[PDB]
Coordinates of C-alpha atoms and ligand atoms in Angstrom, one line a residue:
Chain A
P3 CA 0.0 0.0 0.0
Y4 CA 2.9 2.3 -0.6
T5 CA 2.8 6.1 -1.1
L6 CA 4.3 9.0 -3.3
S7 CA 3.8 12.4 -2.5
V8 CA 5.1 15.4 -5.0
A9 CA 6.5 18.8 -3.4
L10 CA 6.8 22.1 -6.0
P11 CA 7.0 25.6 -5.3
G12 CA 3.9 27.6 -5.3
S13 CA 6.3 30.3 -6.9
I14 CA 5.2 28.1 -10.3
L15 CA 1.6 31.0 -10.4
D16 CA 3.5 33.9 -10.4
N17 CA 5.1 33.2 -13.9
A18 CA 1.8 33.0 -15.5
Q19 CA 0.7 35.7 -17.8
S20 CA -2.7 36.0 -17.2
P21 CA -5.3 35.3 -13.9
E22 CA -6.7 32.9 -16.0
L23 CA -3.8 30.9 -16.8
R24 CA -2.9 31.2 -13.5
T25 CA -5.8 29.5 -12.7
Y26 CA -5.3 26.8 -15.5
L27 CA -1.7 25.7 -14.5
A28 CA -2.8 25.0 -10.9
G29 CA -5.7 22.5 -12.8
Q30 CA -2.5 21.0 -14.5
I31 CA -0.4 20.4 -11.7
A32 CA -3.7 18.8 -10.0
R33 CA -4.5 16.5 -13.0
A34 CA -0.6 15.4 -13.5
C35 CA -0.8 13.9 -9.6
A36 CA -4.2 12.3 -10.0
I37 CA -3.2 10.8 -13.2
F38 CA -0.2 9.0 -11.4
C39 CA -2.3 8.0 -8.7
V40 CA -0.6 10.6 -6.0
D41 CA -1.4 10.4 -2.4
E42 CA -0.1 13.8 -1.1
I43 CA 1.2 17.2 -3.0
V44 CA 3.2 19.7 -1.0
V45 CA 2.8 23.1 -1.9
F46 CA 6.2 24.7 -0.3
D47 CA 7.8 28.3 -0.1
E48 CA 10.6 28.9 -1.9
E49 CA 11.2 32.3 -0.8
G67 CA 3.3 33.3 0.4
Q68 CA -0.3 34.4 -1.4
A69 CA 1.1 31.8 -4.5
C70 CA 1.2 29.0 -2.5
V71 CA -2.3 29.8 -0.8
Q72 CA -3.7 30.1 -3.7
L73 CA -2.1 26.9 -5.6
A74 CA -3.1 24.9 -2.4
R75 CA -6.6 25.9 -2.1
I76 CA -7.3 25.2 -6.0
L77 CA -5.9 21.7 -5.4
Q78 CA -8.3 21.3 -2.7
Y79 CA -11.0 22.2 -4.7
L80 CA -10.5 20.4 -7.7
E81 CA -9.9 17.4 -5.6
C82 CA -13.0 17.4 -3.8
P83 CA -16.0 15.6 -5.1
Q84 CA -18.1 18.4 -6.6
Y85 CA -21.2 18.0 -4.9
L86 CA -19.3 18.8 -1.9
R87 CA -17.6 21.8 -2.8
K88 CA -20.4 24.2 -2.0
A89 CA -20.1 23.1 1.5
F90 CA -16.0 22.7 1.7
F91 CA -15.6 26.2 -0.2
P92 CA -17.1 29.8 0.7
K93 CA -17.1 32.2 -2.4
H94 CA -13.2 33.1 -2.6
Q95 CA -11.3 35.2 -5.1
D96 CA -9.1 32.5 -5.4
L97 CA -11.9 30.4 -7.0
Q98 CA -12.8 33.0 -9.6
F99 CA -11.6 30.9 -12.6
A100 CA -13.0 28.0 -11.6
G101 CA -14.9 27.0 -14.5
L102 CA -12.2 27.0 -17.1
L103 CA -10.6 24.2 -15.5
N104 CA -10.1 20.6 -15.7
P105 CA -12.0 17.9 -14.1
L106 CA -10.0 15.4 -12.4
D107 CA -12.5 12.8 -13.0
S108 CA -10.9 10.3 -10.8
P109 CA -13.1 7.2 -8.9
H110 CA -14.2 9.5 -6.3
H111 CA -16.0 12.0 -8.6
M112 CA -18.6 10.1 -9.6
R113 CA -22.3 10.8 -10.8
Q114 CA -25.4 10.3 -8.9
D115 CA -26.9 7.5 -10.7
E116 CA -23.4 5.9 -10.4
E117 CA -23.7 2.5 -8.0
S118 CA -20.4 2.7 -6.1
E119 CA -19.4 0.7 -3.1
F120 CA -17.9 3.5 -1.4
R121 CA -18.5 7.1 -1.7
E122 CA -17.0 10.7 0.1
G123 CA -19.5 12.8 2.7
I124 CA -20.0 15.5 4.5
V125 CA -22.1 14.6 8.3
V126 CA -25.0 16.9 8.0
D127 CA -26.8 18.7 10.7
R128 CA -29.8 17.3 11.8
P129 CA -31.0 16.3 14.8
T130 CA -30.5 12.7 16.1
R131 CA -31.2 11.4 19.3
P132 CA -27.9 9.3 21.1
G133 CA -27.3 6.0 19.3
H134 CA -28.8 6.9 16.1
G135 CA -25.6 7.5 14.3
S136 CA -25.6 10.8 12.0
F137 CA -26.6 11.7 8.8
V138 CA -23.9 12.3 5.9
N139 CA -24.8 13.6 2.8
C140 CA -22.8 11.5 -0.3
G141 CA -24.6 13.1 -3.2
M142 CA -27.0 10.7 -3.7
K143 CA -30.9 11.2 -3.8
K144 CA -31.2 10.6 -0.5
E145 CA -29.0 11.3 2.5
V146 CA -27.1 8.1 4.4
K147 CA -27.5 6.9 8.0
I148 CA -24.3 6.0 9.4
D149 CA -23.0 3.8 12.7
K150 CA -21.1 6.5 14.3
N151 CA -22.2 10.0 15.7
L152 CA -19.7 12.4 14.7
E153 CA -19.5 16.0 14.7
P154 CA -21.7 17.4 11.9
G155 CA -19.7 19.2 9.2
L156 CA -16.3 16.7 8.5
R157 CA -15.7 15.0 5.7
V158 CA -15.9 11.0 5.9
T159 CA -15.6 7.9 3.7
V160 CA -18.7 6.1 3.8
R161 CA -19.1 2.6 2.7
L162 CA -22.6 1.5 1.6
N163 CA -24.6 -1.4 2.8
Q164 CA -24.6 -4.1 0.1
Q165 CA -28.6 -5.4 0.6
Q166 CA -29.7 -2.1 1.4
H167 CA -33.3 -1.4 2.2
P168 CA -35.0 -0.3 -0.8
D169 CA -37.9 1.8 0.9
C170 CA -36.1 3.7 3.5
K171 CA -35.9 6.9 3.5
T172 CA -32.4 7.0 3.7
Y173 CA -29.7 4.5 2.6
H174 CA -27.4 3.3 5.3
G175 CA -23.5 2.5 5.4
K176 CA -20.6 2.9 7.9
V177 CA -17.9 5.3 8.2
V178 CA -14.5 3.8 7.0
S179 CA -10.9 4.8 6.9
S180 CA -10.0 6.8 4.0
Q181 CA -7.4 4.5 2.9
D182 CA -10.1 1.6 2.6
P183 CA -11.0 2.3 -1.1
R184 CA -7.2 2.1 -2.1
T185 CA -5.5 -0.1 0.0
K186 CA -8.5 -2.6 0.1
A187 CA -10.6 -2.4 -3.6
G188 CA -7.5 -0.7 -5.5
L189 CA -9.4 2.6 -6.1
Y190 CA -7.5 5.7 -6.2
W191 CA -9.1 8.0 -3.9
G192 CA -7.6 11.1 -4.0
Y193 CA -4.7 13.3 -2.9
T194 CA -4.1 15.5 0.4
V195 CA -2.5 18.8 0.2
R196 CA -0.1 19.6 2.5
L197 CA 1.6 23.3 2.9
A198 CA 4.9 23.8 3.5
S199 CA 6.8 26.7 4.8
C200 CA 10.2 26.2 3.3
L201 CA 12.4 23.2 1.7
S202 CA 13.4 21.3 4.5
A203 CA 10.0 22.0 5.7
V204 CA 9.1 19.5 2.6
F205 CA 11.1 16.7 4.7
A206 CA 10.4 17.4 8.4
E207 CA 7.0 17.8 8.5
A208 CA 6.2 14.6 6.6
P209 CA 2.6 12.9 7.5
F210 CA 4.6 9.7 8.3
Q211 CA 5.8 8.5 11.4
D212 CA 9.4 7.1 9.9
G213 CA 9.3 10.3 7.3
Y214 CA 10.0 9.2 3.5
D215 CA 12.5 6.5 3.5
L216 CA 12.7 7.5 -0.7
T217 CA 13.6 11.0 -2.0
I218 CA 14.3 12.1 -5.5
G219 CA 15.1 15.4 -6.7
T220 CA 14.8 16.3 -9.7
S221 CA 16.9 18.5 -12.3
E222 CA 18.6 18.9 -15.9
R223 CA 21.8 18.2 -13.4
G224 CA 21.2 15.0 -12.1
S225 CA 22.1 11.7 -13.1
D226 CA 20.4 9.9 -15.8
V227 CA 17.5 8.5 -14.6
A228 CA 17.8 5.1 -17.0
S229 CA 20.7 4.3 -14.8
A230 CA 19.2 5.2 -11.2
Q231 CA 18.1 1.7 -9.0
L232 CA 15.4 3.0 -6.5
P233 CA 15.7 0.6 -3.1
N234 CA 12.5 -0.8 -1.5
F235 CA 10.2 1.7 -0.2
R236 CA 6.8 2.4 1.5
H237 CA 6.6 6.4 1.4
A238 CA 7.9 8.2 -1.7
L239 CA 9.0 11.7 -2.1
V240 CA 9.4 13.4 -5.7
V241 CA 10.4 17.1 -5.7
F242 CA 10.4 19.5 -8.1
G243 CA 11.8 23.4 -8.3
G244 CA 10.5 26.2 -9.7
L245 CA 11.3 28.6 -12.3
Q246 CA 14.7 28.9 -10.9
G247 CA 15.0 25.3 -9.9
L248 CA 15.5 23.2 -6.4
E249 CA 18.8 25.7 -5.8
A250 CA 16.6 28.5 -4.9
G251 CA 14.6 26.9 -1.9
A252 CA 17.6 25.4 -1.1
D253 CA 19.6 29.1 -0.7
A254 CA 17.1 30.5 0.7
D255 CA 16.3 28.3 3.6
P256 CA 18.4 29.3 6.4
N257 CA 18.2 25.4 7.9
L258 CA 19.8 23.8 5.0
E259 CA 23.1 25.4 3.9
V260 CA 24.4 23.4 1.3
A261 CA 26.6 23.8 -1.9
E262 CA 24.2 21.2 -4.5
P263 CA 21.0 20.4 -4.0
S264 CA 22.0 16.4 -4.8
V265 CA 22.9 16.1 -1.0
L266 CA 19.3 16.7 0.1
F267 CA 17.7 13.6 -1.8
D268 CA 18.1 9.8 -2.0
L269 CA 18.7 10.3 -5.6
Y270 CA 18.8 13.3 -7.8
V271 CA 17.9 12.8 -11.7
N272 CA 17.6 14.2 -14.8
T273 CA 14.4 12.3 -16.3
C274 CA 14.9 14.0 -20.0
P275 CA 18.1 12.9 -21.5
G276 CA 18.9 15.4 -24.4
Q277 CA 16.2 17.4 -24.1
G278 CA 15.1 19.6 -27.0
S279 CA 14.1 22.9 -25.3
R280 CA 16.5 25.0 -22.9
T281 CA 14.1 24.6 -20.2
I282 CA 11.0 22.0 -18.7
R283 CA 8.4 23.5 -17.1
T284 CA 7.1 22.4 -13.8
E285 CA 3.9 21.4 -15.0
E286 CA 5.8 19.5 -18.3
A287 CA 8.6 18.0 -15.8
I288 CA 5.8 16.4 -13.2
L289 CA 4.2 14.6 -16.2
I290 CA 7.8 13.6 -17.7
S291 CA 9.3 13.0 -14.3
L292 CA 6.3 10.5 -13.2
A293 CA 6.2 8.8 -16.2
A294 CA 9.8 8.1 -16.4
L295 CA 10.2 6.4 -13.1
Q296 CA 6.8 4.7 -12.5
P297 CA 8.2 1.9 -13.5
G298 CA 10.9 1.5 -10.8
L299 CA 8.5 3.2 -8.3
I300 CA 5.9 0.0 -9.0
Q301 CA 8.3 -2.5 -8.6
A302 CA 10.4 -1.0 -5.9
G303 CA 7.0 -0.6 -3.6
Chain B
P3 CA 20.4 9.9 -37.6
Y4 CA 17.0 8.5 -36.9
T5 CA 13.8 10.3 -36.9
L6 CA 10.5 10.6 -34.4
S7 CA 6.9 12.1 -36.1
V8 CA 3.8 12.8 -34.3
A9 CA 0.6 12.8 -35.0
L10 CA -2.6 14.4 -33.5
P11 CA -5.9 15.6 -34.5
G12 CA -6.5 19.0 -34.9
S13 CA -9.8 18.5 -33.6
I14 CA -8.2 18.9 -30.1
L15 CA -8.5 22.6 -30.4
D16 CA -12.2 23.0 -30.4
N17 CA -12.7 20.8 -26.9
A18 CA -11.0 24.2 -25.4
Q19 CA -13.2 26.5 -23.1
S20 CA -11.6 30.0 -24.3
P21 CA -9.9 31.5 -27.6
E22 CA -6.6 32.0 -25.1
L23 CA -6.7 28.5 -24.0
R24 CA -7.1 27.3 -27.8
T25 CA -3.7 29.1 -28.4
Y26 CA -2.2 27.7 -25.1
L27 CA -3.3 24.2 -25.6
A28 CA -1.3 24.5 -29.3
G29 CA 1.5 26.5 -27.4
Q30 CA 1.6 22.8 -24.9
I31 CA 1.7 20.8 -28.0
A32 CA 4.8 22.1 -29.9
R33 CA 6.9 22.3 -26.6
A34 CA 5.8 18.7 -25.7
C35 CA 7.1 17.7 -29.3
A36 CA 10.4 20.3 -28.8
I37 CA 11.2 18.9 -25.5
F38 CA 11.3 15.4 -26.9
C39 CA 13.3 16.3 -30.2
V40 CA 10.5 15.5 -32.3
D41 CA 11.4 15.9 -36.3
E42 CA 7.8 16.3 -37.9
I43 CA 4.3 16.8 -36.3
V44 CA 1.6 15.4 -38.3
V45 CA -1.6 17.0 -37.6
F46 CA -4.8 15.2 -39.2
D47 CA -8.4 15.5 -39.7
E48 CA -10.6 13.1 -37.9
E49 CA -13.9 14.2 -39.5
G67 CA -11.2 21.8 -41.0
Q68 CA -10.0 25.3 -39.9
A69 CA -9.0 23.5 -36.5
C70 CA -6.0 21.7 -38.3
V71 CA -4.9 24.5 -40.4
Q72 CA -4.9 26.9 -37.1
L73 CA -3.3 24.3 -35.0
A74 CA -0.4 23.7 -37.6
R75 CA 0.0 27.5 -38.4
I76 CA 0.7 28.2 -34.8
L77 CA 2.9 24.9 -34.3
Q78 CA 4.9 26.5 -37.5
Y79 CA 4.8 29.8 -36.0
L80 CA 6.6 28.4 -32.8
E81 CA 9.0 26.8 -34.6
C82 CA 10.2 29.3 -36.5
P83 CA 12.8 32.0 -35.1
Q84 CA 11.4 34.8 -34.0
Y85 CA 13.6 36.8 -35.8
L86 CA 11.9 35.3 -38.8
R87 CA 8.4 35.3 -37.9
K88 CA 7.8 38.7 -39.5
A89 CA 8.9 37.6 -42.7
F90 CA 7.1 33.8 -42.9
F91 CA 3.8 35.0 -41.2
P92 CA 1.5 37.7 -41.8
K93 CA -0.8 39.1 -39.5
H94 CA -3.5 36.4 -38.8
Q95 CA -6.1 35.8 -37.0
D96 CA -5.2 32.7 -35.8
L97 CA -2.0 34.4 -34.3
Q98 CA -4.3 36.8 -32.4
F99 CA -3.4 35.1 -29.1
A100 CA 0.6 34.8 -29.8
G101 CA 1.8 36.4 -27.2
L102 CA 0.5 34.0 -24.0
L103 CA 2.4 31.5 -25.4
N104 CA 5.7 29.5 -23.9
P105 CA 8.5 29.8 -26.2
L106 CA 10.3 26.4 -27.8
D107 CA 14.0 27.7 -26.5
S108 CA 15.3 25.2 -29.1
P109 CA 19.2 25.1 -30.0
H110 CA 18.0 27.4 -32.9
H111 CA 16.3 30.0 -31.3
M112 CA 19.0 32.2 -29.8
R113 CA 19.5 35.7 -29.4
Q114 CA 21.9 38.0 -31.8
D115 CA 24.9 38.2 -29.4
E116 CA 24.9 34.4 -29.1
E117 CA 28.1 32.7 -30.8
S118 CA 26.7 29.9 -33.1
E119 CA 28.2 27.6 -35.7
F120 CA 24.5 27.7 -37.7
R121 CA 22.0 30.0 -37.9
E122 CA 18.3 29.7 -39.7
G123 CA 18.3 32.5 -42.7
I124 CA 15.6 34.0 -45.1
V125 CA 17.0 34.8 -48.3
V126 CA 16.8 38.9 -48.5
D127 CA 16.2 41.2 -51.7
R128 CA 19.1 43.1 -52.6
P129 CA 21.1 43.2 -55.9
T130 CA 23.3 40.7 -56.4
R131 CA 25.7 40.5 -60.0
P132 CA 25.6 36.4 -60.8
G133 CA 28.5 34.7 -59.4
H134 CA 28.1 37.1 -56.2
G135 CA 25.8 34.4 -54.2
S136 CA 22.9 35.6 -52.0
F137 CA 22.5 37.9 -49.3
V138 CA 20.9 36.1 -46.0
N139 CA 19.4 37.6 -42.8
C140 CA 20.4 35.5 -40.1
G141 CA 19.0 37.7 -37.2
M142 CA 22.9 39.4 -36.8
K143 CA 24.3 42.5 -36.4
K144 CA 25.1 42.2 -39.9
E145 CA 23.5 40.4 -43.3
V146 CA 25.2 36.8 -44.4
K147 CA 26.6 36.7 -48.0
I148 CA 26.3 33.3 -49.0
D149 CA 28.0 31.0 -51.8
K150 CA 25.0 29.8 -53.9
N151 CA 22.4 32.2 -55.9
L152 CA 19.1 31.3 -54.3
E153 CA 15.3 32.6 -54.6
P154 CA 15.0 35.9 -52.5
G155 CA 12.6 34.3 -49.5
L156 CA 13.2 31.2 -49.2
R157 CA 14.0 29.5 -45.8
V158 CA 17.7 27.9 -45.5
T159 CA 20.4 26.9 -43.0
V160 CA 23.6 28.7 -42.7
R161 CA 26.6 27.4 -41.4
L162 CA 29.1 30.4 -41.0
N163 CA 32.8 30.8 -41.6
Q164 CA 34.7 30.0 -38.5
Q165 CA 37.2 32.7 -39.5
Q166 CA 35.3 35.5 -40.5
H167 CA 36.7 39.0 -42.0
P168 CA 35.9 40.9 -38.6
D169 CA 35.9 44.4 -41.1
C170 CA 33.7 43.4 -43.8
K171 CA 30.2 45.0 -43.9
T172 CA 28.5 41.2 -44.1
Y173 CA 29.3 37.9 -42.7
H174 CA 30.2 35.0 -44.8
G175 CA 28.8 31.3 -44.7
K176 CA 27.4 28.4 -46.8
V177 CA 24.0 27.4 -47.1
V178 CA 23.9 23.6 -45.9
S179 CA 21.2 20.9 -45.4
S180 CA 18.7 21.5 -42.8
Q181 CA 19.7 18.1 -41.4
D182 CA 23.5 18.9 -40.6
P183 CA 23.1 20.8 -37.0
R184 CA 21.3 17.2 -36.0
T185 CA 23.1 14.6 -38.0
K186 CA 26.1 16.4 -37.5
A187 CA 26.5 18.5 -34.5
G188 CA 23.8 16.8 -32.3
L189 CA 21.8 19.8 -32.1
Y190 CA 18.1 19.8 -32.1
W191 CA 16.9 22.2 -34.8
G192 CA 13.0 22.0 -34.8
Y193 CA 10.5 20.3 -36.4
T194 CA 8.9 20.1 -39.6
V195 CA 4.5 20.1 -39.6
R196 CA 2.7 18.5 -42.0
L197 CA -1.1 18.3 -42.7
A198 CA -3.0 15.5 -43.1
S199 CA -6.6 14.9 -44.3
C200 CA -7.5 11.8 -42.6
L201 CA -5.7 9.1 -40.6
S202 CA -4.7 6.6 -43.3
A203 CA -2.7 10.1 -45.0
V204 CA -1.1 9.9 -41.8
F205 CA 0.7 6.8 -43.4
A206 CA 0.3 7.2 -46.7
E207 CA 1.7 10.7 -47.4
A208 CA 4.9 10.2 -45.1
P209 CA 7.9 12.7 -46.0
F210 CA 9.9 9.0 -46.3
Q211 CA 10.7 7.0 -49.5
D212 CA 10.2 3.5 -47.3
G213 CA 7.6 4.9 -45.4
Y214 CA 7.3 4.6 -41.1
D215 CA 9.2 1.5 -40.3
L216 CA 7.6 1.4 -36.6
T217 CA 4.2 3.0 -35.9
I218 CA 3.2 3.2 -32.1
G219 CA -0.5 3.6 -31.7
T220 CA -1.7 5.2 -28.1
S221 CA -5.2 4.0 -26.5
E222 CA -5.6 2.9 -22.7
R223 CA -6.8 -0.3 -24.7
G224 CA -3.4 -1.2 -25.6
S225 CA -0.8 -3.5 -24.5
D226 CA 1.6 -2.5 -21.2
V227 CA 4.4 -0.3 -22.6
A228 CA 6.5 -2.1 -20.2
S229 CA 6.0 -5.4 -21.9
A230 CA 6.6 -3.7 -25.5
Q231 CA 9.7 -4.5 -27.4
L232 CA 10.7 -1.9 -30.1
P233 CA 12.4 -3.4 -33.5
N234 CA 15.2 -1.5 -34.9
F235 CA 14.2 1.5 -37.1
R236 CA 14.7 4.7 -38.7
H237 CA 11.5 6.6 -39.1
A238 CA 9.1 6.0 -36.1
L239 CA 5.4 7.3 -35.6
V240 CA 3.8 7.8 -32.7
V241 CA 0.1 8.8 -33.1
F242 CA -2.3 10.1 -30.7
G243 CA -6.1 10.3 -30.9
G244 CA -8.7 13.1 -29.9
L245 CA -11.5 12.9 -27.5
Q246 CA -13.1 10.4 -29.0
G247 CA -9.5 8.2 -29.1
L248 CA -8.1 7.1 -32.4
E249 CA -11.1 5.1 -33.2
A250 CA -13.1 8.1 -34.4
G251 CA -10.6 8.6 -37.2
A252 CA -10.4 5.4 -38.0
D253 CA -14.2 4.9 -38.5
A254 CA -14.6 8.4 -40.4
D255 CA -12.0 7.4 -42.6
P256 CA -13.6 5.4 -45.9
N257 CA -10.0 3.6 -46.9
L258 CA -9.6 2.4 -43.3
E259 CA -12.5 -0.5 -43.0
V260 CA -11.2 -1.8 -39.7
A261 CA -13.0 -2.7 -36.1
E262 CA -10.4 -2.1 -33.8
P263 CA -7.2 0.3 -34.1
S264 CA -4.6 -1.9 -32.8
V265 CA -4.5 -3.4 -36.5
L266 CA -3.4 0.1 -37.9
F267 CA 0.1 0.2 -35.7
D268 CA 3.1 -2.1 -35.3
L269 CA 2.1 -1.4 -31.6
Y270 CA -0.7 -0.3 -29.5
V271 CA 0.7 0.6 -26.3
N272 CA -1.0 1.8 -23.0
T273 CA 1.9 4.0 -21.5
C274 CA 0.0 4.9 -17.9
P275 CA -1.2 1.6 -16.0
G276 CA -3.7 2.3 -13.2
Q277 CA -4.2 6.5 -14.3
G278 CA -6.3 7.2 -11.7
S279 CA -8.0 9.7 -13.8
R280 CA -11.0 8.6 -16.3
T281 CA -9.1 10.3 -19.1
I282 CA -5.7 11.2 -20.1
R283 CA -5.9 14.4 -22.6
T284 CA -3.9 14.4 -26.1
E285 CA -1.5 17.3 -24.9
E286 CA -0.8 15.1 -21.5
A287 CA -0.7 11.8 -23.3
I288 CA 2.1 13.0 -25.2
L289 CA 4.6 13.8 -22.8
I290 CA 3.5 10.2 -20.5
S291 CA 4.1 8.1 -23.9
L292 CA 7.3 9.9 -25.3
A293 CA 8.9 9.9 -21.8
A294 CA 7.5 6.0 -21.7
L295 CA 9.1 5.2 -25.0
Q296 CA 12.4 7.5 -25.0
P297 CA 14.4 4.4 -23.6
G298 CA 13.5 1.7 -26.0
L299 CA 13.8 4.9 -29.1
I300 CA 17.2 5.9 -28.3
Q301 CA 18.2 2.2 -28.0
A302 CA 16.1 1.0 -31.0
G303 CA 17.2 3.9 -33.4
Ligands
SAH1 N1 15.4 17.3 -17.5 C1 15.0 17.6 -16.0 N2 14.9 16.3 -15.5 C2 14.5 16.4 -13.9 N3 13.7 17.5 -13.8 C3 13.6 18.4 -14.7 C4 14.3 18.4 -15.5 N4 14.2 19.9 -16.3 C5 13.5 20.6 -15.6 N5 13.4 20.1 -14.5 C6 12.3 20.4 -13.1 O1 11.3 21.2 -13.4 C7 11.8 22.4 -12.5 C8 11.8 23.8 -13.2 S1 12.9 24.1 -14.7 C9 14.1 25.3 -14.1 C10 15.6 24.8 -14.5 C11 16.3 26.2 -14.0 N6 16.8 26.9 -14.9 C12 17.5 25.4 -13.6 O2 18.9 25.3 -14.0 O3 17.7 24.7 -12.0 C13 13.2 21.8 -12.2 O4 13.3 22.5 -11.1 C14 13.6 20.5 -12.1 O5 12.6 19.8 -10.9
SAH2 N1 -3.4 5.2 -20.7 C1 -2.9 5.7 -22.2 N2 -1.8 5.3 -22.8 C2 -1.6 5.7 -24.2 N3 -2.1 6.8 -24.5 C3 -3.7 7.1 -23.7 C4 -3.6 6.9 -22.7 N4 -4.9 7.4 -22.3 C5 -5.0 8.2 -23.5 N5 -4.2 8.3 -24.4 C6 -4.0 9.0 -25.4 O1 -4.8 10.3 -25.7 C7 -5.9 10.3 -26.6 C8 -7.1 11.3 -25.9 S1 -7.9 10.5 -24.4 C9 -9.5 9.6 -25.1 C10 -10.2 8.5 -24.9 C11 -11.2 8.2 -25.4 N6 -12.0 8.0 -24.6 C12 -11.3 6.6 -25.5 O2 -11.3 5.7 -25.6 O3 -10.6 6.4 -26.7 C13 -6.3 9.1 -26.9 O4 -6.7 8.9 -28.3 C14 -4.9 8.6 -26.6 O5 -4.3 8.4 -27.8

C-alpha cells in the first residue's frame, strides 16, 4: 500500500501570463498528480499568497463536486474555477453511479444518541451511519450491499479513507500540505518514519535510466520552480548546502537530451512521474 | 540519425474553453514535441479550420522569432501569440550568441551573378552566401569560422537543414505536415520507405513495459482526440477496421492504473514520449 508524494513551489503561479492561465496552471498540477495516483501534494514556499492559492485550487479540484459548496465559500482564488479540467477520479462520480464507497459530509439534522449520524453522499437520499460524529466533517462512507429499498435514507458505515485504495484498488484522491520552506517538505512529513525514498529532479542530476530505486513505503519526488531546486535551498536558513543533490536519496535528470532549454514544472511532473513509474511500482 | 514523428488530430482545439486556451493548448503541443526532439508533427483531420490553426501555430513557434515577421503576415489565428511559451530550442538564439549554424531568410538585394545571395540570419550584419538562391526561401547557414572582422557582411554557406542535428547533435526543430484523414498519416509520409515503426496510443493497448521495439529509422507515434483513435478510423472511408490496434506495429497503454478516467492528448504526449524514449533511443 505504498504512497507517493509530490512537492512543488507555489511560486510556479507567479510566472503565469494572465489570471486565467494562473488558474489553469494550478489545474494542470492537480491532473498530473491525479493521473499518477499521487497520495499527497506538498506546496512549499521557495522564498506567501502563491502557495495558498495553489493549495486551495488543488483542494477544490480534489474535492467531489457535490461537496465543494459545503467546504469552499465563495473565494477570489476560485474566480476562474469554471475554466478548469475535472480530475475525473474514481471518487468523482455522478449520482446514478453505483459505488461501494462514497465521500460524504456529516449533515446537521437532529439525532437521538445511539442513532448514528446523517451524511450527505451526493445521492438521492442522505445516508445514515453507525457512529455519532461532528456535523461538518468529511468522511468515507462504505454503503451496505443489501440496502432497505424503501427506507427514506440509505445505510452505510464510516471507514478509513485509505480503505478504497488499500482494499479495492481504487485511487481515492490526494491530500494537500502547505510547507513553509524546503526543509519543511521533509521534516513535516505526514508519516512517522518520514520519507524513506526522496527523489530530486534537475537537468544536472544523473540519468534516470541508470538510477536504481531501493525498496520503499513512502516516496517523495521533489520539483523546483523557475530557478530550480537551488533557490529554495539557498533561501532556507536551515539548509546550508552548495549543491541540491545531497538533500535527496537520488538526483535525476529524467529527459536525456531535451530539445528545449527548460522544462517547465508542470511539464517536468508528467515526464518525471512517467519516467519513474516503472521503478516506483516494482520497488514498492 | 533516426527520426521521430508525432500525429495528433486538429480537433483537439475545439475542446478548449476559451480562445486564449485554444492558443495555449496549441503551444503545449509544440513544447512537448520540442522537448523530446520530435522531427515532424502531423496534424490530421479526424472527421477543417482546427487543423489549419493548429498547424499554423505549430509553424509559428518552431520558427526563429527574428524570422516570423517575414514568414507570417498578421493572422487572426495568431491573435493570442503573446500568451505562449517559447520553444527555447537550439535554433532560437539571441543576436549576441555565437553559433556555428543559424537559420535564415534569403533577402532581396541586388547581386551580380557569381556573387551568391544575401541572407538575414538575425545578426548585426547580413550574411553573404555561396549559392544564388530565390529571395524569400528559408535556409540553414553554416557560418565561416574565421570571418573577415571588418567586412560589412558575414560569410557562410547554405547547408542541409539536417546538418545541425546529424552532424553537431543539435536539435533543430520539427516540420509540420497537414494530413486529411488517418490513412493519410501513413500514406503521405515524408520518407521513401515510409514509417518502419508505427506506435498507437490507447488505454486499451498493451502495457508499454512489455513492448519490444524493433530496430528502426523513422518512427511515428500516433495520438487520438477526445473520442480516441477509433473516431478517425471509423470516419476514414479507406480504413474499414473494427479495432485500431491493427493499423500500428504496436498499440500501447503508457500509463498503467491511471487515476483519472481520461488522459488528455497534450498530457498523453508527454507521458507517452517519456515512457517510450528509453526504447526509442536504443532501437534507433
Ligand atoms: N531534465 C530534467 N529532469 C528532471 N527534472 C527537470 C528537468 N528539467 C527541468 N526539471 C524540473 O523542472 C523544474 C523547473 S525547470 C527550471 C530550471 C532552472 N533554470 C535550473 O537550472 O534549475 C526544475 O526545478 C526541475 O525540478
Ligand atoms: N493510458 C493511455 N496510454 C496511451 N495513450 C493514452 C492513454 N490515455 C489516453 N491516451 C491518448 O490520449 C488520447 C485522448 S484520451 C481519449 C480517450 C477516449 N475516451 C477513448 O476511449 O479512446 C487517446 O486517443 C490516446 O491517444
